[PDB]
């Protein structure tokens, strides 16, 4: 059945191994042969799979390790709440959120660096933040420095709880294997307990605290006089003075007269004109609706009583003619291998983060988030990068599974077999498309640029010339605009304001949203994204399929997951290891994402954001030039890189100086990485030797013999810096630009 059998004191808490570096691995433990040793110490620190050969210990280590990862997050949260309480103009920000920048960092004045303390207003100074906590603390009705302090302590305590918990469950009472593999109950609790009861509890706090309090601040009152949140929960008559449905108590909920709670549980849609965010009634309803759906879904898989499904039997009924044995056997290979689960989870959590970034800019959920141009740009950019990386990780661990855990004599699967057998078709067809999109997406930009350069602006691809109208997006925009009429009679308005119809929402002389048009200039760039996404898929997919064998090397599996090459024979076999396919994917992931966050930044400044006249005419930040200048490659140079880098470049001598330095500093690191990617090891090894000789002359030759980095480390350092230089350069480019213009 399903029970809790654990062990007692597997590994004794002691400090011995803390003074025996490289104890975990048998190879590393003998000592530092050369400096190659101190690099292999960290490269194999967390690879629990290579230390031991059984699933039980690997499990207990990953289970306890997560507790550490969970603990750090709490400590990270604790600082953010603490800092917002002791070093912020939050309470001032609650008075005029429209035109006082959120600041929650203050620097010590040592070497003149107090120039960084910007005049964010509100009688305060400091680094203007952009993570947008302030809109999060207002949407939860905090309205006090004291309440930000107590949660900071509460957040800190849990960190000690988690960190303690990690210790307890690896040294004192560690679970057994049978505990881990019972994945029906695993899903059963997470769906009902974590996901389900998480929302319902939160839908609680919104009903009794965030809603009635924020309804005071939105109504307009000084924060200091809002009765404390435990007054409503005690004095039930106060909730009556706003929400008369709270007189009858919770009995309508029990008599199915649910249309009595219509005051604070609605289906409005749209955005709030006062605060530019969603209607907290909808949000209040939303988590409640989600709560029920998850909770019921929790009760599906059989755990201990008669009722419930069997995850094994579900996978063993779907087998088709084209597919053969179908999903039989996938239960094992998804249960006796952590690298399978980590690869599968990474892709979904990777994808979801992206969808988060597409929704949070079009349905602004927190109050006074819409007119916070510094926040919108950062939050959209941040989760794109997070979403991009995690997807690449799903390729690496899927590739690792093919090399280490896959075995067609015991863990045999049929679908994963058929997929292997026709892999030549899969890559070649994906190869042709990546070429097709390559010619018809970039080429149109090149042809546009050539014709424009020759004085033929009537042969370019644009709205004023040969036209390419996205109709399919223009059609679906139409449908969502008229959905409130027929196909969703409950809704008062559309689910957003970017649908091809409606009206803008103005908050304090700053546009929240308005219908986003889709002309030709948008059609091209959407087919750029379809191109770089496909190419990135090609590299990672090729790595996963060919991680065990190919027509070049027939025994690549025997060489492991990350090996440099197989020598210069057969024409040259540099970079055939699956690790080097993900190594290549990173650049395209860095390429796909970068154009997306360029596309978002220009489209919103040119077509959406911007001030609004008192009369009613709207003037966007860049004057609406995206629809004409974004179709020529030179256009992306003049009017985006050259014209929107002005603020970062001349940011010297004012609080935005720290961005001016990072802008340069990130170039230096980017250009630095090239030394590792372009060159090779055998040159650096020899130059090291001559340097080593001079130290022999003066007797200062070390005993950990100097060595050059290993082949796959020269690449690993090469890509890491390149990514760090590329991402940070955009970081300093964006924040300094948007903070100055809005």
């Amino acid at each position: 059945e399903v029970k809790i059998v654990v062990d007692r004191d597997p590994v004794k808490t002691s400090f011995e191994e803390w003074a025996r570096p490289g104890h975990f691995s048998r190879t590393l433990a003998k000592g530092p042969d050369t400096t190659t040793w101190i690099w292999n110490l960290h490269a194999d620190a967390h690879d629990f799979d290579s230390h031991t050969g059984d699933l039980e210990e690997i499990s207990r280590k990953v289970f306890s390790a997560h507790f550490g990862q969970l603990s750090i997050i709490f400590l990270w949260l604790s600082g953010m709440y603490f800092h917002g309480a002791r070093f912020s103009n939050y309470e001032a920000w609650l008075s005029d959120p429209t035109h006082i920048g959120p600041s929650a960092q203050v620097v010590w004045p040592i070497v003149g660096q107090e120039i960084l303390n910007g005049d964010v207003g509100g009688g305060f100074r400091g680094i203007q933040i952009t993570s947008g906590f302030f809109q999060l603390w207002r949407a939860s009705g905090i309205t006090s420095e004291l309440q930000l302090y107590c949660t900071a302590i509460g957040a800190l305590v849990f960190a000690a709880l988690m960190l303690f918990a990690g210790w307890f469950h690896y040294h004192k009472a560690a679970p057994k294997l049978a505990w881990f593999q019972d994945v029906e109950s695993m899903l059963n609790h997470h769906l009902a307990g974590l996901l389900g009861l998480g929302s319902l509890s939160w839908a609680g706090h919104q009903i009794h605290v965030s809603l009635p309090i924020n309804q005071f601040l939105d109504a307009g009152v000084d924060p200091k006089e809002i009765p404390l949140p435990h007054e409503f929960i005690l004095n039930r008559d106060l909730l009556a003075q706003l929400y008369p449905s709270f007189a009858e108590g919770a009995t309508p909920f029990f008599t199915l007269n649910w249309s009595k709670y219509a005051e604070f549980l609605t289906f409005r849609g749209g955005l709030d004109p006062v605060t530019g965010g969603l209607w907290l009634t909808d949000i209040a309803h939303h988590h409640l609706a989600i709560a029920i759906l998850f909770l019921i879904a929790g009760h599906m898989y059989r755990t201990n009583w008669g009722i419930g499904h069997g995850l094994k039997d579900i996978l063993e009924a779907h087998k088709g003619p084209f597919t053969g044995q179908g999903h039989k056997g996938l239960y094992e290979i998804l249960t006796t291998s952590w690298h399978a689960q980590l690869s599968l989870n990474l892709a979904m959590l990777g994808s979801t983060t992206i969808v988060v970034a597409h929704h949070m800019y079009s349905m602004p959920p927190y109050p006074y988030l819409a007119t916070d141009y510094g926040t919108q740009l950062s939050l959209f950019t941040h989760h794109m990068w997070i979403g991009g990386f995690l997807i690449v990780g799903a390729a690496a661990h899927a590739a690792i599974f093919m090399v280490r855990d896959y075995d067609p004599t015991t863990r045999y699967n049929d679908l994963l077999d058929r997929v292997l057998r026709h892999r030549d078709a899969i890559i070649s067809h994906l190869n042709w498309v990546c070429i097709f999109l390559g010619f018809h997406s970039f080429g149109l930009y090149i042809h546009n640029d050539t014709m424009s350069a020759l004085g033929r602006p009537q042969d370019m691809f644009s709205d004023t010339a040969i036209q390419l109208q996205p109709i399919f997006a223009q059609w679906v925009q139409n449908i969502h605009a008229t959905a409130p009429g027929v196909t969703a009679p409950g809704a008062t308005t559309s689910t957003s304001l970017t649908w091809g119809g409606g009206e803008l929402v103005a908050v304090g002389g700053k546009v929240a949203l308005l219908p986003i048009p889709l002309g030709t200039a948008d059609f091209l760039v959407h087919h750029i994204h379809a191109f770089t996404i496909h190419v990135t898929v090609l590299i990672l997919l090729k790595g996963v399929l060919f991680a065990r064998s190919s027509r070049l090397i027939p025994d690549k599996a025997n060489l492991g997951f990350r090996f440099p090459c197989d020598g210069p024979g057969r024409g040259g076999t540099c970079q055939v290891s699956a690790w080097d396919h993900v190594f290549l994917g990173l650049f395209w992931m860095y390429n796909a994402i970068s154009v997306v966050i360029f596309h978002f930044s220009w489209k919103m400044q040119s077509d959406v954001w911007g001030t609004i006249s008192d009369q009613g005419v709207v003037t966007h930040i860049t004057g609406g030039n995206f629809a004409q200048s974004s179709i020529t490659i030179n256009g992306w140079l003049r009017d985006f890189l050259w014209a929107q880098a002005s603020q970062v470049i001349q940011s010297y001598g004012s609080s935005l100086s720290a961005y001016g330095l990072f802008f340069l500093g990130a170039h230096f690191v980017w250009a630095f990485s090239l030394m590792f990617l372009f060159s090779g090891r055998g040159y650096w090894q020899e130059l090291i030797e001559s340097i080593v000789w001079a130290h022999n002359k003066l007797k200062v030759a070390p005993a950990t013999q100097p060595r050059a980095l290993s082949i796959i480390q020269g690449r690993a350092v090469g890509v890491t810096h390149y990514l760090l230089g590329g991402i940070a350069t955009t970081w300093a480019f964006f924040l300094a630009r948007i903070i100055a213009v809005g």
Binding site: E1, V2, K3, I4, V5, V6, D7, R8, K172, A173, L234, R236, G249, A250, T251, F254, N304
Partner: protein
């Protein structure tokens, strides 16, 4: 051996030798296959009897002071429903010889001596009658059963004088009473949230008017 809502798992280990047994256990807890901490069938039994005993004096104090305020010679000042005695300030309080939070720490220290020593005898039988404790060591060794230490300080006259059946009969009475009190205290609470007029009053509300039946009403007030 009367069984109530038994289960195949339950009757593999609930042998009935433990007093208060009725073979009721559908959540895998007392299962002896899985024993880390706090899931030992002894410890759970140890926590079962203690919680009951705390309930057996917790319940009576949860209805004594107001009901004794119904006729008794208690001056009405210290005759109050239990939740307004001072435990829950938002329900009310009363000014005792102290001011609160000094009563707490005093209480937590006095409890600390009895509690921790009460814990050690579970870890190390007979240990608490070895180191010097101002005399009294002759008793604090216990009889070897942590839940039933015995001794002239704990079992002064001595019942269960000599009869295991009686003791088994007695301990059966001790748990079923314990279960009765735990549920009862859970009654005095959930009544308070909904009724909000005090425990013993809420029995009169159903006495003078059985048609009250606050279930159907479900009005909430402090």
């Amino acid at each position: 051996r009367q069984l109530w809502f038994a289960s195949k798992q339950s009757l593999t280990y609930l042998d009935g030798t433990l007093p208060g047994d009725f073979g009721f256990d559908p959540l895998g807890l007392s299962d002896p296959e899985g024993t880390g901490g706090f899931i030992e069938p002894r410890w759970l039994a140890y926590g079962e009897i203690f919680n009951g005993r705390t309930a057996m004096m917790g319940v009576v104090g949860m209805i004594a002071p107001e009901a004794l305020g119904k006729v008794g010679l208690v001056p009405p000042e210290t005759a109050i429903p239990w939740f307004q005695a001072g435990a829950i300030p938002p329900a009310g309080t009363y000014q005792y010889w102290a001011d609160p939070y000094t009563l707490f720490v005093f209480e937590m220290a006095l409890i600390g001596f009895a509690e921790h020593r009460r814990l050690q005898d579970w870890y190390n039988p007979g240990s608490m009658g070895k180191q010097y404790f101002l005399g009294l060591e002759k008793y604090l060794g216990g009889s070897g059963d942590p839940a039933y230490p015995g001794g002239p300080i704990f079992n002064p006259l001595g019942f269960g004088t000599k009869s295991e059946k009686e003791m088994k009969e007695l301990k059966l009475k001790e748990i079923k009473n314990g279960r009765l009190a735990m549920l009862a205290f859970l009654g005095m609470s959930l009544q308070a949230i909904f009724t909000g007029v005090g425990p013993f009053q809420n029995l009169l509300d159903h006495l003078s008017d059985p048609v009250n039946n606050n279930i159907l009403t479900s009005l909430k007030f402090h």
